[PDB]
Design a protein. Sequence first.
Length: 100
Amino acid sequence: MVEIAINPASEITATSAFISGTVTKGCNISLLYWEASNPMHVKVASSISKKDFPADISATIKDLKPHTTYQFKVTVNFYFSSSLQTFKTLALESKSTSIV
């Protein structure tokens, strides 16, 4: 009886990513993210209580492990889960300035 839209992650860096979703048709909405190898170690990008539908939830999750695969979903009222989206962080990278 509820519809959830989840978007692929954008603005992905070595240690951060931007995840978003939308609920279209007092209820809780949460962005839940975790690294692929540890779906138990699950963190919360955002928690909002909108009674107003449709609803947009966004969060720029920081402090991520470089070069690591993460997954995130959107959960409504703690039991109604949407589908998964998958992304992987970048590794650390520098400004190499060679001399020739």
